[model samples]
Target: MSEQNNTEMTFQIQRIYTKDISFEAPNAPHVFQKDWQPEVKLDLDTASSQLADDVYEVVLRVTVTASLGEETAFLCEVQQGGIFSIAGIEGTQMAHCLGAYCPNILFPYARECITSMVSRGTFPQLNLAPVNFDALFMNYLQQQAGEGTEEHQDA
Candidate 1:
């Protein structure tokens, strides 16, 4: 019979590792020609698993494909991973931290890679705007709070 939950502990970041990072421009020879109406598509995937009671590894995998009409113009794939120590929290709180925090930490590196790759393929440099993932995550938390209150009212 313990009164305390025994979950109040601090989590420190151990390390961050990148498994792979790559990009390809198949149409570099002619994709930049005039009259090219290319379409851009971006796909994102994320995963997290606990290595220890207070340690977790979060990974973000992003693939960007640009195509013109029916042919593929270029493709970029990035896999960024970070090791985070989370304690004093569990359930949705932990999930949200790993899912949002780690990526927020690694996105700048990924953005630099993408910018470089795109610049190399095209003539001029392609600069991407700085992202505000932290704000985004905070907004998500607010929305969840609102929803939870609504559910309580309904109940």
Candidate 2:
């Protein structure tokens, strides 16, 4: 039993909840009168902060903005957070777990929150596309490494 415990790695989600959310319709009545066609934009970010021993808080923030011509139709923002318990991982693996894996788990909740908020605003249905958290995390790591290299050269 002790040997089994030593060899086992565990990651568990303690809770999933919405940390914050907001929706705005600055030109609601007037914008609705215009053609329904609108341009939509999505922005996403993820962050993790240690909460306690073997516990972390991961947050996924999503912002959706839709515009018709020069006027704005609606804007929705959601911050979905999860409390995770992680053990038996360290170094780069731990970073990946906190940065990429945790966010990946939270993205669906954030997307759902954004979509629901948009629907509640009485605008046309807005469906956000799936995000690739792994790719994004890798890109971020590469950018950080590049910056470090540049700073070293400058020094």
Candidate 3:
């Protein structure tokens, strides 16, 4: 390892992997023959933790659900994560790294997994649009600006 270049910025991604996966079709046999009109929704969440001095793990979790008419077709969820070694970044930059940047990087992988799970479950392939995490992060900041609470345990 280098000793003199300690002041330089470093953002090294060690590995990207899927941590968890779940796919279910409660009404499988009959749902396939129904109309193709599907109403879909997704919920996105991200969580980060420090593993070492400059190393961190960020998890990008996505929940997907699709329904046709009055029946629920299928649901898929995935947690895609990455290990990053980031140094010389301070304040909001660090928060952005975990909140927006890393989550954006993992979104495609998570989307692919969800699509795969959906199609493999004998359901229609789900084409999820790209998420704008930067905008979402800004929204979080706005809400937190007024609703100040050190404790975020409650909803």
Candidate 4:
């Protein structure tokens, strides 16, 4: 039965939660004095590692900052993660499941966490756009292929 299980694909969501979070307001009251016009910067990264026989952990780390003049209005960092059980699928398909699907599953919650944290830090809501990990993964694969790959579409 154990060997037979590999013939069929299986995926399970064990848990999803904020693995780590930090909110910073470097200028605080001083920043509030300036005009609300702010510059925002966002960073994103996704990583995964096998935990056991079938369990894996995927994490999406997002960092965002809003600044007015030279001081930061607010900054929010979130490490959103999920534990999943995936089986049967192999090769690139299994890579896709972990690289694309798993991150997509955790993205919305990460966005909300940043939004809430931004609002709580006494700034306007910072609603992040949804990410397309599938396309990103595809692009990554093509880059690794490195032989006359055509341009990929963007949103």
Q: Please, what are the lDDT tens digits per residue for candidate 3 over residues 88-109?
A: 8766766766777878888899
Residue pairs that clash (backbone atoms under 3 angstroms), model 3: none
- Per-residue CA lDDT of model 4 for 72-94, tens digit only, reads 88888899989989877777777
Residue 37's lDDT in candidate 2 = 74
Model 4 gets an lDDT of 0.82
Model 4 scores a TM of: 0.78
> What's the lDDT for residue 131 in model 1?
60
Task: Kindly report which residue pairs in candidate 2 clash with one another.
Answer: none
Error of 3 at 39 (Å): 2.1
lDDT of 1 at 66: 79
How many residue pairs clash (N, CA or C atoms closer than 3 angstroms) in each of the candidate models, in the order given?
A: 0, 0, 0, 0
> Which parts of model 2 have CA positions greater than 4 angstroms off?
1-9, 135-155
How would you encode candidate 2's per-residue C-alpha lDDT over 2-76 as one tens digit per residue? Answer: 113245557989899999888999999899789877888888776777889988888878888888988999988
The Cα error of candidate 3 at residue 94, in Å, is 1.6
* Residue pairs whose backbone atoms clash in candidate 1: none
